[PDB]
Amino acid sequence: MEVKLLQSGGGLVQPGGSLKLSCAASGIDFSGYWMSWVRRAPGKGLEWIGEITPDSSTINYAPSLKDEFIISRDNAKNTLYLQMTKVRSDDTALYYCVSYYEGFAYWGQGTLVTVSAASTKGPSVFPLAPSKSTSGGTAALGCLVKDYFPEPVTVSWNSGALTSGVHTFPAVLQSSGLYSLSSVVTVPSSSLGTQTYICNVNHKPSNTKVDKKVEPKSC
Amino acid sequence: STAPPAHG
Amino acid sequence: QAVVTQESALTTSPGETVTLTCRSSTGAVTTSNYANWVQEKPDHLFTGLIGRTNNRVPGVPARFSGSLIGDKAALTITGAQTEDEAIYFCALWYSNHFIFGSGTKVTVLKRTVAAPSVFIFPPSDEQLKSGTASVVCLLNNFYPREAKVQWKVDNALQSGNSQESVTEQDSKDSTYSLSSTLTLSKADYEKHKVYACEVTHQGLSSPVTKSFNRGEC
Fold first, then answer.
1. A10 and A109 assigned to the same domain
2. Of C108, C131, C147, at which residue does a domain stop?
3. CA C134, C137, C141, C144 torsion: positive or negative?
4. For burial by CB atoms within 10 Å, which of A37, A103, A130, C209 has the most?
5. N-term to C-term CA, chain A
6. Which residues in chain B are contacts of C31 at CB distance < 8 A?
7. How far apart are the C-alpha atoms of A95 and A92, rounded to whole Å?
8. Which residues of B touch C91 (CB under 8 A)?
9. Cβ–Cβ below 8 Å for C165 and A47
10. How far apart are alpha carbons C198 and C211 in whole angstroms?
11. Using the beta-carbon criterion (under 8 Å), do B6 and A99 form an inter-chain contact?
């Protein structure tokens, strides 16, 4: 067998909630492996949560997070558990279970935990428009998809006709608990007053469809 | 007989 | 407690040798710190490279070396390949806990460096009616990911009101695109006039600045 660490854990929880992530091992004698939990925040780098011995005799935690997380393991089930209690907004991250072999050897696929007290809200779509570039330089326009919850949002241009040069960025979870995203497209500035560009935003969780037209400020 | 950890 | 520090970024060519360092605020990095080196490739792909300062994870190529250089722990990629282009996190053990570093964006040149095209977008009037203003800065199709974006409002460097997002590396031409969003209240937006985005990137001789003045064309 090949080593596989399969995580199973919740996704969305509200501030003050609790969650328990699991990491089931198959392909190693789990009973003779040190285990560890790490996490990757959206902006921050890796952050070490903790580690636990094969017999669970010694459990080490990062000093900053000793009271929020509880590490445990069941070697009979070949499973590692992480309990997060009374979470906060900054706990939004990808949580990974690692198995030590001279180092951070075997990893799980990671489980996303999103902490936000937000309710389902449809996005507000705003135009990202240029003055008309008077040098003829290539021009860029777009849409700002702001203040929505939950995550999945689809943006297309001209009902899918416009595909080349489009860059739809990943959403960023704002401090307010809401996501914000921007879709951008580059076109020749010559065809800025002549051609129409429309961004089609679809937020299925709130049943919102928005077709916004982007044109340079009239001046 | 365990697997080597990342520290000692 | 302690702060673990490593280079922000490094750029090298295929076949060359690069060396990343890892610094401890408590003093010199000794072997009792059991330095670990972990790599994150695009799409959040984590791989263990080095542990216990010198010990490779079984299966890792020998071009990855763990050493101690003076006061610091060191990861040496000898004869780097394009697949080694990733973010390298260092970790130091302080008796009962690991502390990770900020990470080092190592770059192995897949293609000639490409400078971003920088664009600035002022807030819309539709949005202004709602009481907030978002100024957006777009860096387009630049190769080495590392870029610094500073917001200047009337020559005053802004901090805390900006959030960045960046696309996945294109498979064809290995390029990236970046959007920095500066969010601030309508009062603050109508209080100042000159809004500038200063981009610094390896493909540029001097940092480039794109600006607009509120109310003007």
1. yes
2. C108
3. negative
4. A103
5. 68
6. none
7. 9
8. 6
9. no
10. 9
11. no
